[PDB]
């Protein structure tokens, strides 16, 4: 029922920008918070930030403050993450994850992740 | 803050195993809303535990979260082959989440 859909991959050039999408289905989009997480081979997970889709309020990991922009499109119930001035260190798998703020405080459902490869 | 987890743990089918999550800054309390997430082959993530001990709908009853000493802990009672995966814990520190390095759990069949 609950589904977070993310496109498979992004092959982009050093210095470009990418917009990642996470389409939510099977639940009321504005009732749960949406988070973005980065995964790099052997470097575990890094929290980028989250967005409350009802108000548009964001909170970011200070390391990604000047790199990432989170927005939502309520009518289409899609969450977006824009990454600018990409470098090789930006090549990773990026996940969107729903967080039950008003309920039990878990990251219950995760998208499949978008693999971003920054290459010339 | 740095969140630390055991690197790798090995168990056998039917055994009881416990994984821990330690904070750099002191004791893990209920104000850290400890989360346990599981990564299965093929980058498949599922949330197991949230807010220290709340099990997500659909998670088998053999997974339980608690605070043991000055650490968040994930206990698997009667480990199965399907439980071989990477377990990540995450701690909330007032305005940001910090993820541990993950624990690779090997279930020897
Ligand atoms: C109320 C329950 N508190 C929590 O679940 C912890 C809590 C607080 C705040 I403010 C948050 O922004 C988040 N988060 O972003 O996921 C978590």
List key phrases describing it:
heterodimer, A: 120 residues, mainly beta, Immunoglobulin-like, six-stranded mixed sheet, four-stranded antiparallel sheet, B: 109 residues, seven-stranded mixed sheet, globular, binds ligand NIP, signal (chain B), immunoglobulin (chain B), immunity (chain B)
Describe the structure.
The complex is a heterodimer of chains A (120) and B (109). Chain A has 120 residues and is mostly beta strands. Chain A has a single domain, classed as Sandwich (Immunoglobulin-like). Helix content of chain A is 0%, strand content 48%. Chain A has no helices and ten strands. Chain A has strands spanning 3-5, 9-12, 18-25, 33-39, 45-51, 58-60, 68-73, 78-83, 92-99, 114-118. In chain A, the strands form two sheets. In chain A, strands 2-10-9-4-5-6 form a six-stranded mixed beta sheet, with no helix packed on it. Chain A has a four-stranded antiparallel beta sheet with strand order 1-3-8-7, with no helix packed on it. In chain A, a hairpin with a 5-residue loop joins strand 4 and strand 5 (45-51). With 109 residues, chain B is mostly beta strands. Chain B has one domain (1-109): Immunoglobulins (Immunoglobulin-like, Sandwich), CATH 2.60.40.10. Chain B is built from no helices and eleven strands. In chain B, the strands form two sheets. In chain B, strands 2, 4, 5, 6, 9, 10 and 11 form a seven-stranded mixed beta sheet that branches. Chain B has a four-stranded antiparallel beta sheet with strand order 1-3-8-7, with no helix packed on it. The radius of gyration of chain B is 13 Å and the shape is globular. Chain A binds chain B through residues 35, 37, 39, 44-47, 59, 61-62, 93, 95, 97, 100, 104-110, 112-113, and chain B through 33, 35, 37, 43-51, 54, 56-57, 88, 90, 95-102. The complex binds the ligand O=C([O-])CCCCCNC(=O)Cc1cc(I)c(O)c([N+](=O)[O-])c1. Residues 33, 50, 59, 99, 101, 105 of chain A line the site of ligand NIP. Chain B: It comes from Mus musculus (Mouse). Chain B: This is Ig lambda-1 chain V regions MOPC 104E/RPC20/J558/S104. Chain B: Keywords: Adaptive immunity, Immunity, Immunoglobulin, Pyrrolidone carboxylic acid, Signal. Chain B: Residues 1-105 form the Ig-like domain. The PDB classes it as immunoglobulin.
């Amino acid at each position: 029922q609950v589904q977070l859909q993310q496109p498979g991959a992004e092959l982009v050039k050093p210095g470009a920008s990418v917009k990642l999408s996470c389409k939510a289905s099977g639940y009321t989009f504005t009732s749960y918070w949406m988070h973005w997480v980065k995964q790099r081979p052997g470097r575990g997970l890094e929290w980028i930030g989250r967005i409350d889709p009802n108000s548009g309020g964001t909170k970011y990991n200070e390391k990604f403050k000047s790199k990432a922009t989170l927005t939502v499109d309520k009518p289409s119930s899609t969450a977006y993450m824009q990454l600018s001035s990409l470098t090789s260190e930006d090549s990773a798998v990026y996940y969107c994850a729903r967080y039950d703020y008003y309920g039990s405080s878990y990251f219950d459902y995760w998208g499949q992740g978008t693999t971003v490869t920054v290459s010339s | 803050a740095v969140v630390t987890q055991e690197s790798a743990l090995t168990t056998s089918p039917g055994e009881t195993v416990t994984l821990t999550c330690r904070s750099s800054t002191g004791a893990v309390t209920t104000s850290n809303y400890a989360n346990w997430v599981q990564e299965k082959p093929d980058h498949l993530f599922t949330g197991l535990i949230g807010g220290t001990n709340n099990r997500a709908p659909g998670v088998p009853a053999r997974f339980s979260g608690s605070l043991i000493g000055n650490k968040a802990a994930l206990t698997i009672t009667g480990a199965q082959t399907e439980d071989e995966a990477i377990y990540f814990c995450a701690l909330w520190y007032s305005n940001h989440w910090v993820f541990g390095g993950g624990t690779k759990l090997t279930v020897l069949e």
